[PDB]
Amino acid sequence: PTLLSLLLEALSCPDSVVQLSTLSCLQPLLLEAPQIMSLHVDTLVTKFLNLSSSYSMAVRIAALQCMHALTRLPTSVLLPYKSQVIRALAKPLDDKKRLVRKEAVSARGEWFLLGSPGS
Amino acid sequence: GRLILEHTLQGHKGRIWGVAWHPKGNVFASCGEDKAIRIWSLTGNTWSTKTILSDGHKRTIREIRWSPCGQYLASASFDATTAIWSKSSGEFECNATLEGHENEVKSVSWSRSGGLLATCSRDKSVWIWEVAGDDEFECAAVLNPHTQDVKRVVWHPTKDILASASYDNTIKMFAEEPIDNDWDCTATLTSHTSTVWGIDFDADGERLVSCSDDTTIKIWRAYHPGNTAGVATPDQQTVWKCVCTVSGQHSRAIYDVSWCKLTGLIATACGDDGIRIFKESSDSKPDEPTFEQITAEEGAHDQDVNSVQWNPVVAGQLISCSDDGTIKIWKVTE
Amino acid sequence: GRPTEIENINPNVYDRIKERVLENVPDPFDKREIFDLIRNINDPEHPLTLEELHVVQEDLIRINDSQNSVHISFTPTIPHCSMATLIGLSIRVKLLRSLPPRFKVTVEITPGTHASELAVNKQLADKERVAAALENNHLAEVINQCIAAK
Ligand SMILES: [K+]
């Protein structure tokens, strides 16, 4: 299969090293190839949210940074997820570590601006 | 006493502002931030949404209120309109729309007779409408006595008296003179130090609860001329007096209060996420009544409790909604 | 309301302190973290942050993580600032989006720094009027300009 399918399937791998590994590849793809990444929004949103509640602090951070990077995709395809993401990202706002809470604030704040009067 | 949680419902998306029991007590409706009204029917032991009303309002729906007949439902929303929904075809559709308010409409209420409808808005005004039919609505009076945002309008249970709570820390009564044929303000109730959020009459209608932003609830008694106590009204109209003030029971603003017409119990929806039940003392005097908190659920919701409403058919059954997006039905046992 | 009697201690509190008796270490919310949330909010009219205008200050922030309470005191640039409510509203929206919903936020004008502080404080404390204000598209757009991070 394609490397993209292997990167997506790596998000379900129980090993934290594999999760940090694939997340470091997915974030630049979300920022530089948003039109292609938009096909897999449903599995991207789902798996990123699951990884934001992992035992590893580094995984939770990387997962939320991808949630922030997701906002670079076309807004018209993110809006059907905007409500559940803002509800889901409320939990990492109360995470036990400052470093991950900071990323949760940053990611959730950009999801508030999707349906924004400003362009 | 004990407060028992029976059901938790999460139909809406976002904060949920208002809930109201149908006069049959087997159905309720709810409105919220999602700009939609959900009608909930009870089948067996589970509550479920039978119909979803959307596109009726462009902005948030603050309150919904059932007709005394129970046929049709009215909703006050922030889009400066008050929509009328009707199930004439076996399904609910919006037949009429009441416009006129300058700003967001905060509250609706139906009179005992069912032919009078009252609304209030952020434009400091209180409107009264006349219902000659489902195809006809006529504005009866436009009142601007309140100096600030008017929070709630509630009708008298036995008579056609209107009560309004406002951001100006006051409550106002409205009665129409028979010779004058025009609506007018009866009296002004000034004991709260902050925004008066909710008001509800007792069973007979000679008393009144009011909850406010000052973290207190107050009991108001109606004094007609010739009272034994000696209170005199310079005008012919009746005067209300603060005969009881409960303080220190709530940590934050109290957004709603409901006085049951079956049990006489009082429930409060507070900003500290807590529902508290008050009952009048057995030996409480009619000029200085004493109310005691019999039970409470400090963790009733995860966020602010927005509304509480007793069930007119089922005695001791309470419903509530919150900013956490949940509707919870409770059962209190004295 | 009334303070707990000095002779009594709440059981849920006592157990919760004993629960805390038993990396993985949790990081409490502190004044610095809240200050970092509001210090870079832009002034609606000037190319400066609320920190640079001393509108928000770290020692004007009070917070208790355990008691789920945050208090914000902001000082308007002038005693008759016609933007005091807008500025205070921008602080609420940022904190409303950035803080867990368990936190009850109070945003008030620093005492004696504005002529209409009581009236302004009452508006910002009214969650219904705050909610209705955010449904104003022009108002929410101006707030988003102040809340934007760049
Ligand atoms: K976008």
From Swiss-Prot, chain A:
Post-translational modifications reported in the UniProt record: Ubiquitinated; undergoes 'Lys-48'-linked polyubiquitination.
Repeat positions for HEAT: 1-35, 38-76, 79-117
Modified residues (Phosphoserine): 116
Tissues in which the UniProt entry reports expression: Ubiquitously expressed with higher expression in testis.
Cellular localization per UniProt: Nucleus; Cytoplasm, Cytoskeleton, Spindle
Gene disruption phenotype: Embryonically lethality before the implantation stage.
Annotated disulfide bonds: none
Superkingdom per UniProt: Eukaryota
Task performed by this protein: Key component of the cytosolic iron-sulfur protein assembly (CIA) complex, a multiprotein complex that mediates the incorporation of iron-sulfur cluster into apoproteins specifically involved in DNA metabolism and genomic integrity. In the CIA complex, MMS19 acts as an adapter between early-acting CIA components and a subset of cellular target Fe/S proteins such as ERCC2/XPD, FANCJ and RTEL1, thereby playing a key role in nucleotide excision repair (NER), homologous recombination-mediated double-strand break DNA repair, DNA replication and RNA polymerase II (POL II) transcription.
Similarity comment: Belongs to the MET18/MMS19 family.
Subunit and interaction comment: Component of the CIA complex. In the CIA complex, interacts directly with CIAO2B and CIAO3. Component of the MMXD complex, composed of CIAO1, ERCC2, CIAO2B, MMS19 and SLC25A5. Interacts with CIAO2B; the interaction is direct. Interacts with ERCC2/XPD; the interaction is direct. Interacts with ERCC3/XPB and NCOA3/RAC3. Interacts with RTEL1; the interaction mediates the association of RTEL1 with the CIA complex. Interacts with BRIP1.
Record's protein name: MMS19 nucleotide excision repair protein homolog
Swiss-Prot record, chain B:
WD repeats (start-end): 11-50, 56-95, 100-139, 145-184, 191-230, 249-288, 300-334
A GO BP annotation: protein maturation
Record's protein name: Probable cytosolic iron-sulfur protein assembly protein Ciao1
UniProt keyword terms in alphabetical order: Repeat, Ubl conjugation, WD repeat
Modification comment: Conjugated to URM1, a ubiquitin-like protein.
Cellular component terms (Gene Ontology): cytosolic [4Fe-4S] assembly targeting complex; metallochaperone complex
Domain of life per record: Eukaryota
Listed InterPro entries: CIAO1/Cia1, G-protein_beta_WD-40_rep, WD40/YVTN_repeat-like_dom_sf, WD40_repeat_CS, WD40_repeat_dom_sf, WD40_rpt
Database matches in SUPFAM superfamilies: WD40 repeat-like
Function statement: Essential component of the cytosolic iron-sulfur (Fe/S) protein assembly machinery. Required for the maturation of extramitochondrial Fe/S proteins.
The family this protein is said to belong to: Belongs to the WD repeat CIA1 family.
rRNA processing keyword on record: no
From Swiss-Prot, chain C:
Transmembrane region(s): none
An example Gene Ontology biological process: chromosome segregation
A single Gene Ontology CC term: metallochaperone complex
Alphabetically ordered keywords of this record: Cell cycle, Cell division, Chromosome partition, Mitosis
A family per Pfam: FeS_assembly_P
Annotated InterPro entries: FSCA_dom_sf (IPR034904), MIP18 (IPR039796), MIP18-like (IPR002744)
Keyword Cell division: yes
Phenotype upon gene inactivation: Embryonic lethal. In 0-2 hr embryos, mutants display signs of incomplete chromosome segregation during mitotic divisions likely due to defective organization of spindle microtubules.
Keyword Cell cycle: yes
Signal peptide: none
Function: Component of the crb-galla-Xpd (CGX) complex which is essential for proper mitotic chromosome segregation in early embryos. The CGX complex is also required for cell proliferation in developing wing disks. In the CGX complex, acts with crb to recruit Xpd thus forming the functional complex.
Family, as annotated: Belongs to the MIP18 family.
Assembly behavior: Component of the CGX complex composed of crb, galla (galla-1 or galla-2) and Xpd. Interacts with crb (via intracellular domain). Also able to interact with Xpd in the absence of crb. Interacts with Mms19.
Additional observations: The name 'galla' means splitting in Korean and is derived from its role in chromosome segregation.
Listed name of the protein: MIP18 family protein galla-2
Source organism per UniProt: Drosophila melanogaster (Fruit fly)
Designated gene of the protein: galla-2
